[PDB]
Amino acid sequence: EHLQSKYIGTGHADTTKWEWLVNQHRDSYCSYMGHFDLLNYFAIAENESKARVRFNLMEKMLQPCGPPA
Amino acid sequence: RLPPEVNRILYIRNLPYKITAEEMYDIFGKYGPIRQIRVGNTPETRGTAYVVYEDIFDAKNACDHLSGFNVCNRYLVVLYYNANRAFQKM
Amino acid sequence: GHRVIVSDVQESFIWVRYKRNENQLIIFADDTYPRWVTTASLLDYDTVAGADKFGNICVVRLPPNTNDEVDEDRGLLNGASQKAEVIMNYHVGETVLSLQKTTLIPGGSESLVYTTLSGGIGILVPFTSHEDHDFFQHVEMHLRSEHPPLCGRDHLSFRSYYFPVKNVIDGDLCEQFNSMEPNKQKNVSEELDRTPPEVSKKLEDIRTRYAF
Amino acid sequence: AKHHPDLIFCRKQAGVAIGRLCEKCDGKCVICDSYVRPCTLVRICDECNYGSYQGRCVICGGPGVSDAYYCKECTIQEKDRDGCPKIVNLGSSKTDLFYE
Amino acid sequence: MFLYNLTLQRATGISFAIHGNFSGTKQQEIVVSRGKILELLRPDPNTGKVHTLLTVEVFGVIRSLMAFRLTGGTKDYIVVGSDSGRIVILEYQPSKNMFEKIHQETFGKSGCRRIVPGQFLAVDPKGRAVMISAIEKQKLVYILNRDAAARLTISSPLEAHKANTLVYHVVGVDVGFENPMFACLEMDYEEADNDPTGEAAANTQQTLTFYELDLGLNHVVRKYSEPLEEHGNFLITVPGGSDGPSGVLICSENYITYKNFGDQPDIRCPIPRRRNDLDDPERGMIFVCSATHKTKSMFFFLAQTEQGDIFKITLETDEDMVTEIRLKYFDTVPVAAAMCVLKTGFLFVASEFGNHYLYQIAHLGDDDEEPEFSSAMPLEEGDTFFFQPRPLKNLVLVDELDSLSPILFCQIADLANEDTPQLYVACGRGPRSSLRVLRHGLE
Amino acid sequence: ERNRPLSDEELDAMFPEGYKVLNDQPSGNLPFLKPDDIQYFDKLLVDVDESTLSPEEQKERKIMKLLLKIKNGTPPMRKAALRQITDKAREFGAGPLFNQILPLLMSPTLEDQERHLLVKVIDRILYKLDDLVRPYVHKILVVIEPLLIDEDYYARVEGREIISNLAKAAGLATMISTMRPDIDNMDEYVRNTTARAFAVVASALGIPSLLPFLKAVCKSKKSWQARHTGIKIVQQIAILMGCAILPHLRSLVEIIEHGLVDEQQKVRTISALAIAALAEAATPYGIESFDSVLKPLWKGIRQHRGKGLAAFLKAIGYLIPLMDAEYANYYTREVMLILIREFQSPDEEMKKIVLKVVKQCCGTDGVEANYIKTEILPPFFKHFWQHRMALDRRNYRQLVDTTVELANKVGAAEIISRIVDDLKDEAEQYRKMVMETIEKIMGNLGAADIDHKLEEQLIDGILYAFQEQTTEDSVMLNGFGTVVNALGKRVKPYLPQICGTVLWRLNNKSAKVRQQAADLISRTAVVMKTCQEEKLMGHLGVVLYEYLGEEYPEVLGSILGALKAIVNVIGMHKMTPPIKDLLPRLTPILKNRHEKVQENCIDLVGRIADRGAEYVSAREWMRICFELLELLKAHKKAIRRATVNTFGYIAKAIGPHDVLATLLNNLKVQERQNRVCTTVAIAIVAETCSPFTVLPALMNEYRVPELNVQNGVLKSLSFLFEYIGEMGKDYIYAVTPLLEDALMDRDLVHRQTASAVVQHMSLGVYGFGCEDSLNHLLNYVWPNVFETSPHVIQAVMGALEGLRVAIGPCRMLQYCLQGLFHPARKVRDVYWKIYNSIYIGSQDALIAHYPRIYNDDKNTYIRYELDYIL
Amino acid sequence: NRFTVAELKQLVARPDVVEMHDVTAQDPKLLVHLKATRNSVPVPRHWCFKRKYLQGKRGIEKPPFELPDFIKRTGIQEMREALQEKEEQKTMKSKMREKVRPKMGKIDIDYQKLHDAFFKWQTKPKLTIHGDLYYEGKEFETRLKKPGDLSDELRISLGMPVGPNAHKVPPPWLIAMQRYGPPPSYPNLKIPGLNSPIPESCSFGYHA
RNA sequence: GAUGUCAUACUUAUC
């Protein structure tokens, strides 16, 4: 009720798997954008810099798994 | 506003046996008119008494101003009267 | 030696026994805690030290039974039967990309040198006696309460972010006693019943014996 | 508190106003209601401490005497990083005993 | 067994970098944050090298750090956010040689989550407020005040949260003796997640929202909100008041848009790419830093793209409105996370992959023979701006700080036939990679 | 009923032997119904006879019948009726429940307890009847309307909570549609109650949710009554939510600026009161909010006189600190003459408004002290310092605040020279107000400005006020203590003159005079050690050592408090009443049945055990430890917290070998508040002394075949672990088989105690490498989360929150795995709650501990960023 | 809409974790993926019962307490039992007279013995893994043997003394194993006297 | 195993 409205990503008993997967992907993107080690590993894995990787992580926050079902 | 545990009668435990009726009437009559006072005259009920007042507020003020009163060399206690606790010996 | 340590990128590292007569490779030891380790390093014949991409570094210790004679369907919980345990885990803040147990200085002792992706270099050294380890733990517990970090985060909650700490003494909090106020250092020495030059010598001797 | 399940907290934005405790609830925690090993003080909100509500008790609501603080079990469990632990509504607690 | 972990070599890969008068003298100082370590360097113009004066361990993950100066003061305080939910405002003490924590305001839980603030930290140019915004649906604004004992005090944090709205970046608009304004490129994810058709996720571009914190009402409300035709990556505030065109430009993939509201129109300018480089088949180029500078004559921005072409952009505006935005390729630089342009001609680039550089500005502006472009030029067929590559001619390298942060590979070997062993590791990413052998001896 | 006279037979039948004298019953066991309440329960006197003549509404008569158990029945019967009506509120319906509750609460022969029980039954049936009382919103609002304007604060708070619950349950449209014809009513009290209910609904449902409706109600020009009701609702919303109004100030100010311009003076007075209230709340310092409002207010205050001018002056005095320094200096220079001219006003409301504005008119710079002492303070002393102002509390507290503001602004000596003449008056209320003002002046400013020509007169006035006290108020003793603390070393030729008065007042026929003398000796006990007075304190202690024979227990408790203050202000082993002749003297004094006297005796016993434990021969402590078990089970919450500390001090002094056996023997009592106190005392004794010596003995009390003794031993072990914390790493292996065997018991209380002990061991040994015992206890605590009791569920949630912080969030996510998509919803809801608690505890730690999910056909869930390796 | 258990077993890669109640849930594939994970824990068996996991051991006999060796090696349990036996025989007058003048020194054993038992004589308990849950019948199911080895109880019931000489230490069923041959279910089983040396293989069986 | 009346007992340092 109020816990799902105050803190997003908690869930309830009628939560589907797609919303939980989208919340887990958003939490993983926030942990990658927050921690410097994950951003450095993502910048060393590809040829892009830290700003391009941060823009690609911020642009993928809107529906990271796809359309809902 | 009064709790339901208070009543018109109040019990006293560990009372001196050498106390007269005039001293008990003076100690019980300080908070109001005392209707009746019964002292125990039994070896199994020695040191206990029951003082019933005419007013409920006067009985509550007497029970609030007698718990731990200075007496002879014993530790007297004043408590409220209970129907289930007074007939525990039977 | 007659075994393989297959490090997986998602679950853990699993041990496999190799036979001389046959040619099969049946896994008989795995871990239950998810770590997602990137690299690993072998220290002894039983334990194995690994480092994750999140920033933590753990050491999976083998059980004393070590039933490796398994010839070959359910296991314990969708895996093998002999589940390994962990005895040491510490979060450093950066993803450790290389780890090697060697001797950086001649005449000292063996230590695990680790290189992360943030440019830093760490050195993990074991404890010789229990009294020095208890003194280091008391100094760390005194420095975590008397000298809080500037970022506002707790020192106990920093190494226990992803994996909980177990028998891990943070040397960066113990080496900060020589850069604090003299009154706080004197109070920490009086709480431990020692001298601040003696505490500085005890903090510097282990660092001089373990590394440069 | 933990004794009355009908008690609700404010859960607002905690400012710079430090919480206060009365003489009857001095030393007790706000959430765990423990009087052993204090770790961190309580931060009140702006609406819970304004005008006549400044320097009052967070649990009971009377005049404050000492400073309010949380126990050691709440600082390690990340219970002090929540909103203001101020009791606003008093339901089925210290209300029927005054009328009886 | 009980082990103990010590740090032999400190972290050299700098994640964040700022500059300012932290000591309180006329000279400037650089503050670097490598995630878990905070260092202070003194860019001395006599020798040109960089010397570290203090290095502390924050025992966390510093996501943002910014130096801000109060109104009528000489020393600048550093406000930093970590993985915990507390912003720490500290001041460097030259006498004690340590970072004394002046204030610590807790407004969230620990851990690098999207609800805990600490990701984006913006400060006003005047020094009256500070905005801390998280990744999504969390924002706060603290008001800094000056107590009469020359003290810095923090008021109660305001509430400016908006549900189902993610924030990529935030900055503070310059306002001389006015209410502080915070501009952020917000993105609504409600319609993109409520529509299962998938077409709503393509028309959900970011919009610039400027919220003006009212000091008289003690609250924060969204003043203006303007949509954008492209997804913005970063924001750069321009100095204003008695200076000139106060605003906040937005950077995007081959795009720089000045979108100062009220009366000025949105002026867009494509980023000048290379001449004949075969490095972008269908990809664009976005900016990585701003590096604003002002030598008490005008204002300039040393922008850096994804390739590394450092460009000095200067905006020629009118007395009240903005006329056009001009830019030109200044020099070539390695890829750095943040650049700190200091006074007396000094530019410090802290590369996240490779070594850090500290150069001296010899020819500022360089508007003599360079083919500079402008936003008011009627150019068609895409960007139509092909800049030619050239070596470093306006700046000369003075200091090169070795930063082998990318030590992915590391082996301890004694192949040099010496007594003490050596360590062969790797550094850099891409073309700046190098095999480095390190020994315990001195140079 | 309780004050009815009884006969001799009823008095003799209620006394045991061995004492010397010195149809009207509805359906059986229903309680006695009142003769005036035979209208609502008229269908209960006849038999039911349910045989094809029972409609559904007759079951609503059962809803009346439980109401017969709820109005004047037994409190267990009332609790059973409340439990039957709360769990069956959805099946009975809100319709007949409201139709039976509405004439019962509107009876003219009701009481306070019956109205409180009806309000509690309406609030308890409001959580299950959500979105169903929308036709019954007006019938509840008409009954909850006089509850907010009641005299008692608890009934007003209950009415405000009921109004907030009705606004949260009925939404915003139904409350706006129900209160819409209640604004233009002819009754002014009903309109004020409707405005207060609308303000409570706007405070409970948000300010912009009711802001355009209030703007349309205030902007409509049809009658002055609707505008007055809207202004009163705005004033009540500004006075209820100060912080909430501040943001809405700009809006609220734009609606309040339209008023105070019509021909009706009542609407202008209501608008001025709303602006004053707004200034107090909305935009507390928002001068701009009052900008467009400061221009007609000065014109209305200068062009007219009366109640509207007084309201405009009150609004100007409330908005004057909310402006700048120059604006306040310009406003104070033009409002001092209007305040001096209104000092001779015969109206009490205008005088109260002037006294409230005089405290805010001089609170900053701009107003000089000489002009305030010459032309403002003599009319304030001649027009406000009367005898009628001390009768009302609102007229006395505001006058005391104005006097404190005048003493803080002008000076404390000029107020002390004029307030000392009223200390020896013939009125008790005026003398108490003067003593409170003198105490406030001594606490805020101090006594440094008082010279030697007024301090003796103030001390004589304080002595005359303390010696001629007729009530039981502690204001005079606190004022004398504050005056003694402000004097300090200046009261050195005053200690014999106070001691000769205290010794004379200690021996009197009254009982409250000795208690007042003992309270004055206790309040002035700290001023004797700082003035180099050691013989007088010893003489007072020797007098109070023999003053324990006062028959009044309120005087004996005050004498014990004075003895404790004399023992705290002086040395423990340097007292002329020494500890060798006082600790046996207090051993029969600790057996008192009072609350404050027993608390003072327990505090004195704890102080004698902490500071004077070497003054006994180790024999009286073992006898007093057995009497300390009878000092608990008291409804005071003060002696039970000191008895555990006294038992811990006795166990630290005499050794933890004798008190532990008594604490184990007193654990089997089968009484409430007697087993938890002994367990807390045993935990305090184990935390003060060595916890290992009480380690096997705590394993012995679980060996006895008893549930209460095992529960008390588990509670003592949990409290000892919570008091130890980091010291419990060595006592975890000894408590691990006891916690493993206690969790497998059939009793849920023992499982809850084992879960609490496991949570204490997890929160105490977090970060020490003790994750094996936590993972072993989590395997047994995991079937304990499916219980139906809320206490066991809360204990399991606390154990899970401890194990997620001790063993790590990864083990908590692995234990809660495969339960979010469970088929059974009763376990899926608990798994979702555990996942939400683990996410609120540590959200960033769940990224690396997240399981691998395969990608679907339309959507992808595989994390490609973390799966890559360099 | 709700598929059967056969399609859920054929679609999932691990059909052993598929149950009959999981087919009527809101997500069969997600439940099959969560139940067949690496570190996932199964649901308890008391979620579908009707006794709330506490009404099974009603009349079953249970011991009061199992004291460890470190607590029993201090002599506190015998002293507590002696004090409980001495206090149970006292009347109300003997209990009331001991409250005014108590007798000090109840046991008075030692002061450093408890610290030596809790610090030096500390023994680690028998813990378990986090995946092994607890049930109602887990305390009574202790049956959860090797070919070629015999326990002491089986040798006492069968009457076969285990000795180093292989004359009588193998069971008398070894004559049938010598007359018929080795068992076909264990080709690597080695018994002394037939395919193993008698003084070397004294364990009466070897799995090589 | 559910239901509705009565009784006993337990817990949350409740007052």
Coordinates of all heavy atoms in Angstrom, one line a residue, chain F residues 794-846, unseen atoms left out:
Chain F
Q794 N 6.1 -10.7 14.5 CA 7.0 -9.6 14.8 C 8.3 -10.1 15.3 O 9.4 -9.5 14.9 CB 6.3 -8.6 15.8
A795 N 8.4 -11.1 16.1 CA 9.6 -11.7 16.6 C 10.4 -12.3 15.4 O 11.6 -12.2 15.3 CB 9.4 -12.7 17.7
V796 N 9.7 -13.0 14.5 CA 10.3 -13.6 13.3 C 10.8 -12.5 12.4 O 11.9 -12.7 11.8 CB 9.3 -14.6 12.6
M797 N 10.1 -11.4 12.3 CA 10.5 -10.3 11.4 C 11.8 -9.7 12.0 O 12.7 -9.3 11.3 CB 9.4 -9.3 11.2
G798 N 11.8 -9.5 13.3 CA 13.0 -9.0 14.0 C 14.2 -9.9 13.9 O 15.3 -9.5 13.7
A799 N 14.0 -11.2 13.9 CA 15.1 -12.2 13.7 C 15.6 -12.2 12.3 O 16.8 -12.3 12.1 CB 14.6 -13.6 14.1
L800 N 14.6 -12.0 11.3 CA 15.1 -11.9 9.9 C 15.8 -10.6 9.7 O 16.8 -10.6 8.9 CB 13.8 -12.0 9.0
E801 N 15.4 -9.5 10.3 CA 16.1 -8.3 10.1 C 17.5 -8.3 10.8 O 18.4 -7.6 10.4 CB 15.3 -7.1 10.7
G802 N 17.6 -9.1 11.9 CA 18.9 -9.3 12.5 C 19.8 -10.2 11.7 O 21.0 -9.9 11.6
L803 N 19.3 -11.2 11.1 CA 20.1 -12.2 10.3 C 20.5 -11.6 9.0 O 21.5 -12.0 8.4 CB 19.3 -13.5 10.1
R804 N 19.7 -10.7 8.4 CA 20.0 -10.0 7.2 C 21.2 -9.0 7.4 O 22.0 -8.8 6.5 CB 18.8 -9.3 6.6
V805 N 21.3 -8.5 8.6 CA 22.4 -7.6 8.9 C 23.6 -8.3 9.4 O 24.8 -7.8 9.3 CB 22.0 -6.5 9.9
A806 N 23.5 -9.4 10.0 CA 24.6 -10.2 10.6 C 25.2 -11.2 9.6 O 26.4 -11.1 9.2 CB 24.1 -11.0 11.8
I807 N 24.3 -12.1 9.0 CA 24.8 -13.1 8.1 C 25.0 -12.6 6.7 O 25.6 -13.2 5.8 CB 23.9 -14.3 8.1
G808 N 24.4 -11.4 6.4 CA 24.5 -10.8 5.1 C 23.2 -10.8 4.3 O 22.4 -11.7 4.6
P809 N 23.0 -9.8 3.5 CA 21.7 -9.8 2.7 C 21.7 -10.9 1.6 O 20.6 -11.3 1.2 CB 21.8 -8.5 2.0 CG 22.7 -7.6 2.9 CD 23.7 -8.6 3.3
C810 N 22.8 -11.5 1.2 CA 22.8 -12.6 0.3 C 22.1 -13.9 0.8 O 21.4 -14.6 0.2 CB 24.2 -12.9 -0.2
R811 N 22.4 -14.2 2.1 CA 21.8 -15.3 2.8 C 20.3 -15.1 3.0 O 19.5 -16.1 3.0 CB 22.5 -15.7 4.1
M812 N 20.0 -13.9 3.3 CA 18.5 -13.5 3.4 C 17.8 -13.6 2.1 O 16.6 -14.0 2.1 CB 18.4 -12.1 4.0
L813 N 18.4 -13.3 1.0 CA 17.8 -13.4 -0.3 C 17.8 -14.9 -0.8 O 16.8 -15.3 -1.5 CB 18.6 -12.6 -1.3
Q814 N 18.7 -15.7 -0.3 CA 18.7 -17.1 -0.7 C 17.7 -17.8 0.2 O 17.1 -18.8 -0.3 CB 20.1 -17.7 -0.5
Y815 N 17.5 -17.4 1.4 CA 16.5 -18.1 2.2 C 15.1 -17.7 1.8 O 14.2 -18.5 1.9 CB 16.7 -17.7 3.7
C816 N 14.9 -16.5 1.3 CA 13.6 -16.0 0.8 C 13.4 -16.3 -0.7 O 12.4 -15.9 -1.3 CB 13.5 -14.5 1.0
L817 N 14.3 -17.1 -1.3 CA 14.2 -17.4 -2.7 C 13.1 -18.5 -2.9 O 12.8 -19.2 -2.0 CB 15.5 -17.9 -3.3
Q818 N 12.6 -18.5 -4.2 CA 11.5 -19.4 -4.6 C 10.3 -19.2 -3.7 O 9.6 -20.2 -3.5 CB 12.0 -20.8 -4.7
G819 N 10.0 -18.0 -3.2 CA 8.8 -17.8 -2.4 C 8.0 -16.6 -2.9 O 6.8 -16.4 -2.5
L820 N 8.6 -15.8 -3.8 CA 7.9 -14.7 -4.3 C 6.8 -15.1 -5.4 O 5.8 -14.5 -5.5 CB 8.9 -13.7 -5.0
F821 N 7.1 -16.1 -6.2 CA 6.2 -16.7 -7.1 C 5.5 -17.9 -6.6 O 5.2 -18.8 -7.4 CB 6.9 -16.9 -8.5
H822 N 5.3 -18.0 -5.3 CA 4.7 -19.2 -4.7 C 3.2 -19.2 -5.0 O 2.5 -18.2 -5.2 CB 4.9 -19.1 -3.2
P823 N 2.6 -20.4 -5.2 CA 1.2 -20.5 -5.4 C 0.3 -20.1 -4.3 O -0.7 -19.4 -4.4 CB 1.0 -22.0 -5.8 CG 2.4 -22.5 -6.2 CD 3.3 -21.7 -5.4
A824 N 0.7 -20.5 -3.0 CA -0.1 -20.1 -1.9 C 0.2 -18.7 -1.5 O 1.3 -18.2 -1.3 CB 0.3 -21.0 -0.7
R825 N -0.9 -17.9 -1.4 CA -0.8 -16.5 -1.2 C -0.5 -16.1 0.2 O 0.1 -15.1 0.5 CB -2.1 -15.8 -1.6
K826 N -0.8 -17.0 1.2 CA -0.5 -16.8 2.6 C 1.0 -16.8 2.9 O 1.5 -16.1 3.8 CB -1.2 -17.7 3.5
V827 N 1.7 -17.6 2.1 CA 3.2 -17.6 2.2 C 3.8 -16.6 1.2 O 4.9 -16.1 1.5 CB 3.7 -19.0 2.0
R828 N 3.2 -16.3 0.1 CA 3.7 -15.4 -0.8 C 3.7 -14.0 -0.3 O 4.6 -13.2 -0.6 CB 2.9 -15.5 -2.2
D829 N 2.7 -13.6 0.5 CA 2.6 -12.3 1.1 C 3.7 -12.1 2.2 O 4.3 -11.1 2.3 CB 1.2 -12.1 1.8
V830 N 4.0 -13.2 2.9 CA 5.1 -13.1 3.9 C 6.4 -13.1 3.2 O 7.4 -12.4 3.7 CB 5.0 -14.3 4.9
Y831 N 6.6 -13.8 2.1 CA 7.8 -13.7 1.3 C 8.0 -12.4 0.7 O 9.1 -11.8 0.6 CB 7.8 -14.8 0.3
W832 N 6.9 -11.7 0.2 CA 7.0 -10.4 -0.3 C 7.3 -9.4 0.7 O 8.1 -8.4 0.5 CB 5.7 -10.0 -1.1
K833 N 6.8 -9.5 2.0 CA 7.1 -8.7 3.1 C 8.6 -8.8 3.5 O 9.3 -7.8 3.8 CB 6.2 -8.9 4.2
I834 N 9.1 -10.1 3.5 CA 10.5 -10.3 3.8 C 11.4 -9.7 2.7 O 12.5 -9.2 3.0 CB 10.7 -11.8 4.0
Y835 N 11.0 -9.8 1.5 CA 11.8 -9.2 0.4 C 11.8 -7.7 0.5 O 12.8 -7.1 0.2 CB 11.3 -9.7 -1.0
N836 N 10.7 -7.1 0.8 CA 10.6 -5.7 1.0 C 11.4 -5.2 2.2 O 12.1 -4.2 2.1 CB 9.2 -5.2 1.2
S837 N 11.5 -6.0 3.3 CA 12.3 -5.7 4.4 C 13.8 -5.8 4.1 O 14.6 -5.0 4.6 CB 11.9 -6.6 5.6
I838 N 14.1 -6.8 3.3 CA 15.5 -7.0 2.9 C 15.9 -5.9 1.9 O 17.1 -5.5 1.8 CB 15.7 -8.4 2.3
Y839 N 15.0 -5.4 1.1 CA 15.3 -4.3 0.2 C 15.4 -3.0 0.9 O 16.3 -2.1 0.6 CB 14.3 -4.2 -0.9
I840 N 14.6 -2.8 2.0 CA 14.7 -1.6 2.8 C 16.0 -1.6 3.7 O 16.5 -0.6 4.0 CB 13.4 -1.4 3.6
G841 N 16.4 -2.8 4.1 CA 17.6 -2.9 4.9 C 18.9 -2.7 4.1 O 19.8 -2.0 4.5
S842 N 19.0 -3.3 2.9 CA 20.1 -3.2 2.0 C 19.7 -3.4 0.6 O 19.4 -4.5 0.2 CB 21.2 -4.2 2.4
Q843 N 19.6 -2.3 -0.1 CA 19.1 -2.3 -1.5 C 20.3 -2.5 -2.5 O 20.1 -3.2 -3.5 CB 18.3 -1.1 -1.9
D844 N 21.4 -2.0 -2.2 CA 22.6 -2.1 -3.1 C 23.2 -3.5 -3.1 O 23.9 -3.9 -4.0 CB 23.6 -1.0 -2.8
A845 N 23.0 -4.2 -2.0 CA 23.6 -5.5 -1.8 C 22.8 -6.6 -2.6 O 23.3 -7.7 -2.8 CB 23.7 -5.9 -0.3
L846 N 21.6 -6.3 -3.0 CA 20.8 -7.3 -3.8 C 21.1 -7.3 -5.2 O 20.6 -8.1 -6.0 CB 19.3 -6.9 -3.6

